């Protein structure tokens, strides 16, 4: 139904899990009609300030179409999970490509 | 919100004369053509037309003698909030009979001077000095 | 909010065709459609007084169209209310 733009950050030691993390978040959305348009793993990028007393967070950009039930279920999996240091979910205005 | 169309006509004439404007366009009507022609026939307005089929726009052409305008003053008398119907003998004479009062009588729209001689009164629309 | 399919469904049913979309029959139904969607919004929230003013505009607007329709024709006025579930 609606387009989104998820940009979440992950802790250094659990960056090896991120390949596994993406495959679970894809499987939740890809089944329910809307496809993921563009993923792009950013990598272990430096932080502008220390979050949780550490530097270097592992950024991941999904950008995906989904209904409201699946996206809010994905929104809850970030809060009830110590690996993910912050995330945000933006709104529609069509699909996009490139840009970093 | 546009309750009296006739008062609006007489403002466009009044404000057009203040602005020193040549012509005055507005939406037309049955009562608009009747008043506009009576003003023309005596000689406040210098010619007019009713150009249009579906959405007619009656435009007047205002008269000027000197730098001053011809229509000294013009005002609504029988406004819709208070209708004013005067009897034959009780008909007014604007500016002691050298200005006219447009009066809707039973034999069509006419001046106060013609109403006296024709032998009838009616709704006094507007004084024109 | 009323989606494109929701309005177009009501428009191509009460009126003549999808082309016709301004009739008092159509207009009242679109308001009744939005008003009934807004009841679930004002079930909770409650303090949303600014949206209520938009609703009470739609409510009053609907009464003016129905009061117009009644004076215009008593036949189609009564038939419209039986289908929409107004009068109460």
């Amino acid at each position: 139904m609606r387009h989104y733009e998820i940009v979440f950050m992950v802790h250094p030691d659990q960056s090896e899990q991120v390949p596994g993390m993406i495959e679970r978040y894809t499987a939740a959305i890809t089944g329910a009609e809307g496809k993921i348009h563009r993923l792009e793993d950013w990598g272990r990028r430096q932080l502008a300030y220390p979050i949780n007393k550490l530097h270097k967070a592992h950024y991941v950009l999904m950008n995906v179409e989904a209904p409201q039930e699946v996206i809010d279920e994905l929104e809850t999996t970030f809060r009830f999970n110590d690996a993910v240091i912050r995330s945000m979910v933006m709104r529609t205005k069509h699909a996009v490509t490139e840009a970093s | 919100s546009m309750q009296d169309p006739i008062a609006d006509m007489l403002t466009r004439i009044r404000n057009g004369q203040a602005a020193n404007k040549a012509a005055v366009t507005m939406p037309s009507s049955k009562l608009k053509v009747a008043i506009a022609n009576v003003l023309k026939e005596e000689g406040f307005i210098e010619d007019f037309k009713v150009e249009g089929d579906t959405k007619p726009e009656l435009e007047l052409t205002l008269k000027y003698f000197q730098g001053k305008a011809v229509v000294e003053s013009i005002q609504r008398v029988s406004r819709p909030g208070l209708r004013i119907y005067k009897r034959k003998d009780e008909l007014p004479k604007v500016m002691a009979g050298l200005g006219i009062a447009v009066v809707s009588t039973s034999k069509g729209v006419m001046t106060d001077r013609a109403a006296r001689q024709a032998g009838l009164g009616g709704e006094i629309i507007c004084y024109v000095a | 909010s009323l989606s494109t399919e929701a309005t177009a469904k009501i428009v191509s049913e009460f009126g003549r065709d999808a082309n016709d979309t301004g009739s008092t029959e159509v207009q009242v139904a679109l308001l009744t459609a939005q008003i009934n969607h807004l009841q679930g919004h004002f079930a909770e929230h409650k303090k949303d007084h600014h949206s209520r003013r938009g609703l009470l505009r739609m409510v009053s607007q609907r009464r003016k169209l129905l009061d117009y329709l009644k004076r215009k024709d008593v036949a189609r006025y009564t038939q419209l209310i039986e289908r929409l579930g107004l009068r109460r």
Binding site: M9, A48, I51 | - | -
Partner: protein, 65 residues
């Protein structure tokens, strides 16, 4: 100078910080329109994108961290 370009239009996005870091001062604050040109519309899109970039620690809030 002004906006993006002559035939740019586009939208000011938070992800890119190379072109975005020009619009903030050395302290970390957002630079006003009366200094850097920019129309009121694109300054508001910019100001929002700075604040979103700050949430993700792409840009810093300040320089006392």
């Amino acid at each position: 100078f002004c906006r993006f370009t002559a035939e740019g239009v586009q939208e000011i996005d938070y992800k890119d910080i190379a072109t975005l870091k020009n619009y903030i001062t050395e302290s970390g604050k957002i630079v006003p329109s009366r200094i850097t040109g920019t129309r009121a519309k694109y300054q508001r899109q910019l100001a929002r994108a700075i604040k979103r970039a700050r949430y993700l620690s792409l840009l810093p809030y300040t320089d006392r961290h």
